[PDB]
Structures are given as C-alpha cells and as structure tokens.
Amino acid sequence: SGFRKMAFPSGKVEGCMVQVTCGTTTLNGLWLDDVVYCPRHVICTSEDMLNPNYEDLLIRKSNHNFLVQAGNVQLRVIGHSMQNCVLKLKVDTANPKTPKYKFVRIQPGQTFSVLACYNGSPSGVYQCAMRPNFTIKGSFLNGSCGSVGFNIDYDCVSFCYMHHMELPTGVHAGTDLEGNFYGPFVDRQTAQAAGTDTTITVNVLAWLYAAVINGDRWFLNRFTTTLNDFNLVAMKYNYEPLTQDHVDILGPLSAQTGIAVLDMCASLKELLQNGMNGRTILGSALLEDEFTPFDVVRQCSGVT
Amino acid sequence: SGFRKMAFPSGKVEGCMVQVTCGTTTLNGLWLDDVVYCPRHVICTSEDMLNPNYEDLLIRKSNHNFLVQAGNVQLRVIGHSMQNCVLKLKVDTANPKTPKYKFVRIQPGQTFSVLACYNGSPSGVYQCAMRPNFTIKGSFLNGSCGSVGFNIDYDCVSFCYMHHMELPTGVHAGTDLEGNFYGPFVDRQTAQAAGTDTTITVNVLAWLYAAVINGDRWFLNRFTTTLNDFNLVAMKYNYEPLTQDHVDILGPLSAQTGIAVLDMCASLKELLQNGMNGRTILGSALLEDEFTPFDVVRQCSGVT
Numbered sequence: 001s002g003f004r005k006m007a008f009p010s011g012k013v014e015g016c017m018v019q020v021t022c023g024t025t026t027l028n029g030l031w032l033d034d035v036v037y038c039p040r041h042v043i044c045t046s047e048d049m050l051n052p053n054y055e056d057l058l059i060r061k062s063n064h065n066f067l068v069q070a071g072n073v074q075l076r077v078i079g080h081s082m083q084n085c086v087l088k089l090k091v092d093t094a095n096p097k098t099p100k101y102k103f104v105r106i107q108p109g110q111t112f113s114v115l116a117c118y119n120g121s122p123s124g125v126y127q128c129a130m131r132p133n134f135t136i137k138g139s140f141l142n143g144s145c146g147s148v149g150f151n152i153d154y155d156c157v158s159f160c161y162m163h164h165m166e167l168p169t170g171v172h173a174g175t176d177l178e179g180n181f182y183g184p185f186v187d188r189q190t191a192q193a194a195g196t197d198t199t200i201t202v203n204v205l206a207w208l209y210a211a212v213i214n215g216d217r218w219f220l221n222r223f224t225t226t227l228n229d230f231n232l233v234a235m236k237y238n239y240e241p242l243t244q245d246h247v248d249i250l251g252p253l254s255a256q257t258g259i260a261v262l263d264m265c266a267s268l269k270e271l272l273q274n275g276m277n278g279r280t281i282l283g284s285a286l287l288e289d290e291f292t293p294f295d296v297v298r299q300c301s302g303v304t
Numbered sequence: 305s306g307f308r309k310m311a312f313p314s315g316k317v318e319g320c321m322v323q324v325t326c327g328t329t330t331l332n333g334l335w336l337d338d339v340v341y342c343p344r345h346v347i348c349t350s351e352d353m354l355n356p357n358y359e360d361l362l363i364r365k366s367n368h369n370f371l372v373q374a375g376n377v378q379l380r381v382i383g384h385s386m387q388n389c390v391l392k393l394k395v396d397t398a399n400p401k402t403p404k405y406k407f408v409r410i411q412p413g414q415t416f417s418v419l420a421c422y423n424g425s426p427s428g429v430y431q432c433a434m435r436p437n438f439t440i441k442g443s444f445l446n447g448s449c450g451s452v453g454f455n456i457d458y459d460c461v462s463f464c465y466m467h468h469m470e471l472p473t474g475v476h477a478g479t480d481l482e483g484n485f486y487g488p489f490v491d492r493q494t495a496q497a498a499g500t501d502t503t504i505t506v507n508v509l510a511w512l513y514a515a516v517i518n519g520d521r522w523f524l525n526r527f528t529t530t531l532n533d534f535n536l537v538a539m540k541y542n543y544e545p546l547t548q549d550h551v552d553i554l555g556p557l558s559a560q561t562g563i564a565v566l567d568m569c570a571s572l573k574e575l576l577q578n579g580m581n582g583r584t585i586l587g588s589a590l591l592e593d594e595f596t597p598f599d600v601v602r603q604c605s606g607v608t
C-alpha cells in the first residue's frame with residue numbers, strides 16, 4: 001500500500017538525451033535511430049525570439065552548424081529539416097541505446113513523465129499532466145528546452161511532449177514529437193496567456209478510488225447523484241464535465257472497490273461544496289487531478 | 305521556473321535491478337560488481353515471518369537455492385552471506401552496468417529517490433524522505449521488497465535505502481545497504497508501531513524559499529522571530545526543533561532571496577498559527593516537508 005506521484009523509470013529516455021548547439025544557443029535533443037529531434041528555436045538568438053521567421057533563419061544554417069554531442073562524443077550531422085516547430089537532424093550513427101518507441105499526441109487530462117535535462121544531461125524526473133488549457137505545470141529553467149515527456153508500455157516508450165516555452169505566468173508550453181504545439185501557443189517571445197485551468201474530474205475520481213484502496217475513507221458518504229446533477233456542481237467549481245466515457249474508464253476501479261461511480265461523484269460533490277475541513281486524502285490537502293484511472297490501476301496492481 | 309517533487313533519473317539504478325528467488329519467495333536484488341544485495345527474508349516462507357531465526361533458516365540454504373535473474377539471464381551464485389538484515393550473493397559475473405556508487409546511512413529529514421521494482425523490473429520512481437520516526441511514506445505492494453532508495457552526485461549513486469517491510473499502518477520500513485534497519489523495526493511479522501511523525505522544519509522553510517523564488521509570496525509577513533520563540537510554536541505543532549545548524553544550511557537560500565532565515569521562521573509561525581485560509585503554496589494546500597535545502601538549490605539552479 002501507499003500512494004505516490006510516481007514517474008516512469010527514465011533510463012530508456014536518458015539514453016536518448018543529447019546536447020544541440022547552433023551558434024550561441026544550446027538546448028536538449030532526443031536521439032532516436034539516426035535522427036536527433038530538438039526545438040527549431042535552437043537556431044534563434046534571444047533577439048530573434050521576438051518575431052522569428054524560422055524558414056529564413058534556417059536558410060543561413062548548414063549541417064555543420066548543428067553541433068550534437070552525446071555525452072562526450074560528437075555526432076556527425078548529415079541532414080537537417082524543419083517539421084512544424086521541431087528540427088530533425090539526421091546523424092551518421094544510429095543511437096545504439098534507442099529503445100522501442102512511438103510518437104503520440106496526448107489528450108488533455110492525460111499524464112506523462114518529464115525527464116528534465118540541461119546541456120544534454122538529465123537533472124530529474126517527475127510526473128505531469130497535460131492541463132485542459134494545454135499547458136503543463138512543470139519545473140523547467142533556461143536550457144531545459146528539448147526535454148521530453150513520455151509514457152512507457154512494458155518496453156515501448158511513447159514520446160508525447162517536447163519542452164519549448166515558459167509562459168509569463170510560469171506555466172509551460174511545448175509540442176508533441178511531430179513539432180505541433182499543444183494548444184494555441186507559438187514558439188515566439190510574445191504575450192501568450194493560458195485559458196482557464198479546469199480540474200480534470202475523471203482523474204480526481206480515480207484518485208478518490210486510490211484513496212479508498214489505501215484506507216483514506218472519511219470522504220465516503222451516504223449519498224448518490226446523477227451525471228447531470230454532478231455536472232452542475234462541476235461547472236460551479238471549474239471542473240471538467242463528466243461524461244459516460246469517463247464513467248466507463250472508471251469501471252475497473254468501481255468494480256474492485258464496490259463503490260459505484262455516481263456514488264463517488266456524490267463524495268466528490270460534497271467535498272467540492274464543503275471543502276476537506278482541515279483533513280487530508282493520500283497526504284494531500286487539495287483534490288489531486290494528475291493521476292488518470294490507468295495510473296491508479298497501474299500503481300495499485302504493481303505493473304512493471 | 306516551476307517547482308516539482310522531482311526524483312533522480314533512475315537509469316543507473318535500473319541497470320542494477322535483478323530478481324532473487326529462494327524457494328517460493330521472490331523479491332528484488334541490487335547487483336553491484338560481483339555481488340547481489342537483497343533482504344534476508346527472501347529465505348522465509350510467509351509462515352516463517354511470524355518469528356524467524358535467520359541464522360537457522362540460512363543453514364538449510366546453499367548457493368544453488370538462490371536463483372538470481374538479471375532480465376532474462378541467469379547469474380551463477382558462487383557465495384552467500386548474511387550481513388545484518390541483508391543477504392550478499394556473490395555471483396561469478398560483475399554487473400557490466402555497475403555505476404560509480406557508495407553505501408550511505410542517511411539521517412532523518414534527508415530525501416531520496418525510490419525505484420519501486422517487482423520481480424526485478426522497475427515500475428516507477430518517486431521522491432521520499434526518511435521521516436523523523438525512521439519510516440518512509442512510500443508506495444510499495446507485495447514483491448516490492450529489495451527496491452532501493454538512492455541519491456546521485458553527478459555520476460555517483462549513493463544507495464541509502466532498501467525496502468523490507470510494511471507496517472500495519474501502511475508506512476514503510478527498511479534498511480541501509482549494510483542491512484541495518486532505520487529506526488527500531490525488525491524484519492518480523494509483528495506489531496511494530498511507528499513513533500510520532502514530526503514535520504521536518506528545515507525542509508518546510510527550504511520549500512518556503514523555493515516558493516518565494518517561484519513567485520508564491522503571499523505568506524511573507526512584516527514579522528520576525530527568534531530560534532527559541534519559533535521553537536515554542538514548532539513544539540506546539542509537532543515540528544522538529546530548529547537549530548543553528550538548520551539556520552546555517554538555509555544560508556544560501558537566505559542569501560539569494562534576501563529573506564533572513566528568522567524572518568522566514570516568522571512566516572512559517574504565522575502559517576502554523578493561522579493555516580493557509582484556503583490558499584496554496586507551490587500548488588500544495590499543506591506545508592511540504594520533503595524537499596531539503598539542497599534539493600531546492602539543486603532544482604532552482606538546474607544541477608545535472
């Protein structure tokens with residue numbers, strides 16, 4: 001027992017991290033097979049970021065201007081291309097440490113692990129969730145661009161995120177591994193505000209199921225509710241509307257605990273209306289929304 | 305910016321995880337050089353755990369009874385010995401993936417990363433702290449014994465913890481890598497209650513410094529206090545007494561923010577006396593005590 005914000009073991013991803021330098025700019029690259037992926041703004045000076053024309057800026061760059069270093073060995077760059085907001089540097093050597101992998105574009109509400117890197121070297125690993133306004137509440141300092149988000153299914157790494165920007169609000173924006181930004185952000189030093197950060201309702205319910213499994217039961221009540229009734233409360237507290245798809249994904253958790261999804265919704269409803277009255281749930285004094293129903297099943301069953 | 309409960313990149317530790325089986329019991333082992341470390345209760349049946357005599361139980365075990373599997377390859381066991389509560393299985397092959405390493409016995413209040421494993425395979429990684437009552441609030445299910453805690457200084461892995469037990473309260477007990485339990489616990493299925501879980505005061509202050517650095521400033525007040533005055537409040541709220549050593553370790557954080565340690569103590573004091581009034585600090589609605597002053601400096605500077 002016990003429930004923790006757990007990240008995936010990052011070894012498979014650490015083996016892909018490289019450093020990319022173009023002129024005076026250094027960031028992280030992801031080396032998979034004979035290709036290094038990195039944010040296209042590696043070609044920018046801090047001056048260029050106000051209003052860059054990446055196609056024009058790229059015309060001035062040749063293969064030899066992209067210095068790619070894997071630990072202490074230098075990769076030979078034999079090609080470069082821009083796909084959306086990422087650069088693809090074809091190197092002459094396949095990364096011998098390339099794990100089985102996929103590139104996936106995740107939905108808001110989904111969680112992933114971030115291996116924060118600086119100059120091609122990993123600093124740490126933490127769990128994240130793509131917020132409903134398509135930002136992530138990360139921990140990134142200058143030089144962290146190029147760090148990636150991922151999930152792992154047994155031996156396959158699904159890369160979902162690549163870090164590109166920090167909003168003036170201290171929240172983070174980035175792309176999937178095809179270079180497309182999540183949400184409306186652009187790789188430009190401009191005023192970009194994020195939308196409402198709503199709470200991921202399905203994740204809070206799943207975390208309430210994790211809490212009942214681990215002994216925190218005080219919040220369980222004598223009530224029930226309906227999808228429409230619950231959603232009126234969810235709307236008042238800027239929570240995502242719960243759908244029958246969400247009820248369905250919560251099925252296994254409902255099955256193992258014997259607490260019907262709508263009964264848990266009524267516990268959540270009372271907690272929204274009354275707060276926690278100085279109490280805690282799984283060591284938290286707020287309703288945690290960055291564990292999906294899959295993460296809870298995975299942690300509560302011991303999947304490796 | 306942004307502040308997260310970050311774990312160390314676990315790749316170096318994943319390369320050491322092996323599976324150990326003795327009879328019907330399977331747990332995790334740590335393979336470093338030509339030695340596999342694992343909890344000695346691998347030799348026990350669930351029946352033996354009520355009152356085991358490990359020396360007697362071990363007399364019945366030979367090298368060939370300890371099955372050690374690294375991924376899918378079988379290690380040949382050429383020796384076995386019991387050091388305190390750990391077994392040391394000498395294998396005929398040095399682990400080619402052994403990183404630079406040390407064995408350290410940490411103090412209460414110190415933090416470390418746990419690579420939770422099942423059958424020699426990593427499931428996830430999370431940050432922990434050795435509680436002042438020498439327990440850890442982990443996430444461990446059956447088969448997680450043998451999973452290790454560690455810190456990393458550049459390329460050197462300092463192993464500090466090895467998981468052995470779950471208390472009837474759902475908290476966790478284990479040893480350092482010499483087999484000595486932290487706190488008074490024994491590897492036996494008996495009533496073992498933990499002492500008072502006090503809050504690690506120096507870590508809360510360090511986390512308040514991390515919050516000021518990242519923009520959460522609302523809790524800063526017009527007051528100051530003294531070590532003795534603050535400690536009267538700390539005693540009332542079961543917080544660890546703050547010492548001049550703690551004030552000293554907080555020096556760099558005090559220096560970079562310009563907020564004197566005793567002024568931060570007065571912010572902490574008001575927060576203890578008044579609560580957070582529905583507000584949050586670094587996305588938490590409680591005072592976080594599992595970031596040491598070193599963890600905060602490391603995260604706020606980008607150490608790799």
Ligand SMILES: *[C@@]1(O)C(=O)N(Cc2ccccc2OCC)c2ccc(Br)cc21
Binds near residue numbers: 046049140187189
């Ligand atoms: C990341 O390492 C990086 O390249 N970078 C610079 C950057 C990125 C987006 C917009 C502007 C800009 O530079 C302004 C001069 C950056 C910024 C913040 C973070 Br958290 C990481 C990185």
Ligand SMILES: *[C@@]1(O)C(=O)N(Cc2ccccc2OCC)c2ccc(Br)cc21
Binds near residue numbers: 491
């Ligand atoms: C760990 O995998 C393990 O071996 N184990 C069994 C155990 C450990 C301590 C006391 C008793 C006992 O078995 C009782 C039958 C165990 C128990 C709990 C956890 Br979280 C991990 C492990």
